């Protein structure tokens, strides 16, 4: 019976480069083939949606293929960008009929990175606007190849990294939150992972 | 379109619920999945049409019901903590050819003790003065810590006018208790502009957390207050150079 496959399964690629996404299928015999996409804390938009006999589907930079002699598309994304980032399932349908049940792929969780035309590292401590002693990191402005690790200390917390874009001076960086829940404790030391040399770490006073 | 209530949700073990989910594009096909962390969408129940309506995959603990082609009801009647997910209802016309309409989803939590529900403290951090000196930019973070369950909406205001530009919150919460399933809630934003409109003592900046918890109607036998659906905020004034 229908078995849908997605690979890869996680996807992490630099913005401007063109990016393929892959789903096979089990059985060929399907009435038609649909993409969506997912954005975490929201439902799933349609992108495509391909009939058996097609072939081809555009919207834009999204291309969809569909080879229903070998059982699996292709998603073509043309030039991406960190808009692009979430998660991509396709379904299949039956074309028997009697048996509209379609079967989902695991999806394909993208991540498109934004150019850092100027990288400028640097690990800055901010005071809470209560004044309760407490502070915050704020590990911003690297290039997109760094990767932030998880601390190894019980206190301490790291975020991931997200991209925020200043539309007014069409400038985007990326950025990655840290704390702990210590009495007096540097938080700039939780980024001890694999930074750049040159990051500045410039003293909280 | 497909509309799906409510949006979040918690359940106490043993509790009834029902979740709507309508539709006025005249579909006759109109099905419910959940999906799960690892282990993606799968069908609970489906209904080709009105009167009629048919098992998933996996649609023990949930009942359905098809009196109207415009709507589909998911009744659960003895609430389980394994029924906790992230449930999802799709339509589309029994003539193939026309697409399947996915809701919004319905993040269902369910607890053996409501207790385990907390709402988040919330708290804006004012901008370094090495960043605004080195970049003439100032980043506002704002952060909410020790909530649950995962049900929020992270929102900034500046002037009383929500922002979207300079800004990027976690897309996932991180959690306090990695190992626990029941594990508190920890989540982040950040809001940047140029250094002179922080600087700039009248400009007001806000952010606020919309947490959804219990109601009105639960029970609630402790020394703190009961975490009802809530928004929690935090708050900064530009500070002059």
């Known amino acids: 019976k229908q078995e849908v496959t997605q690979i890869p399964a996680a996807l992490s690629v630099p913005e401007g480069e063109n990016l393929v996404l892959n789903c096979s299928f089990t059985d060929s015999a399907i009435y038609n083939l649909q993409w969506f996409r997912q954005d975490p804390g929201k439902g799933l938009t349609s992108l495509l949606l391909?009939?058996?006999?097609?072939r081809e589907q555009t919207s834009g930079r999204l291309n969809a293929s569909l080879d229903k002699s070998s059982g699996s598309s292709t998603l073509y994304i043309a030039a991406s960008q960190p808009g692009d980032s979430a998660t991509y399932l396709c379904?299949?349908?039956?074309?028997?009929?009697?048996?509209?049940?379609?079967?989902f792929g695991r999806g394909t969780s993208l991540i498109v990175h934004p150019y850092i035309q100027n990288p400028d590292p640097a690990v800055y401590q901010l005071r809470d606007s209560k004044s309760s002693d407490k502070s915050v990191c704020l590990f911003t402005d690297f290039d997109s190849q760094t990767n932030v690790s998880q601390s190894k200390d019980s206190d301490v917390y790291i975020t991931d990294k997200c991209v925020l874009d200043m539309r007014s001076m069409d400038f985007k960086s990326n950025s990655a939150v840290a704390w702990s829940n210590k009495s007096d404790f540097a938080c700039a030391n939780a980024f001890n992972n694999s930074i750049i040399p040159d990051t500045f770490f410039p003293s909280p006073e | 379109g497909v509309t799906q209530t409510p949006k979040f949700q918690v359940l106490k073990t043993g509790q009834s619920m029902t979740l709507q989910c309508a539709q006025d594009?005249?579909?006759?096909?109109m099905s419910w999945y959940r999906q799960d962390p690892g282990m993606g969408l799968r069908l609970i129940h489906y209904?080709?049409?009105?009167?009629?309506?048919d098992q998933g995959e996996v649609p023990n603990g949930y009942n359905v019901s098809r009196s109207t082609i415009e709507d589909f009801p998911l009744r659960l009647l003895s609430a389980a903590p394994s029924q906790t997910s992230v449930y999802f209802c799709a339509s589309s016309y029994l003539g193939n050819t026309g697409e399947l309409f996915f809701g919004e989803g319905s993040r269902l939590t369910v607890l053996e003790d409501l207790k385990n529900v907390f709402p988040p403290e919330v708290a804006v951090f004012e901008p370094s003065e090495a960043e605004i000196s080195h970049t003439q930019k100032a980043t506002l973070v704002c952060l909410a810590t020790g909530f649950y369950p995962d049900h929020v909406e992270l929102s900034w205001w500046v002037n009383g006018k929500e922002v979207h530009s300079g800004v990027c919150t976690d897309p996932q919460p991180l959690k306090e208790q990695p190992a626990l399933n029941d594990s508190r809630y920890a989540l982040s934003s950040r809001l940047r502009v140029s250094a002179t409109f922080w600087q700039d003592p009248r400009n007001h900046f806000r952010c606020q957390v919309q947490f959804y918890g219990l109601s009105e109607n639960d029970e609630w036998t402790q020394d703190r207050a009961k975490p009802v659906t809530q928004i929690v905020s935090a708050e900064a004034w530009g500070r002059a150079d």
């Open positions: 594009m005249n579909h006759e096909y």
């Open positions: 209904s080709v049409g009105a009167g009629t309506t």
């Open positions: 391909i009939q058996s006999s097609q």
């Open positions: 379904a299949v349908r039956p074309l028997l009929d009697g048996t509209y049940i379609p079967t």
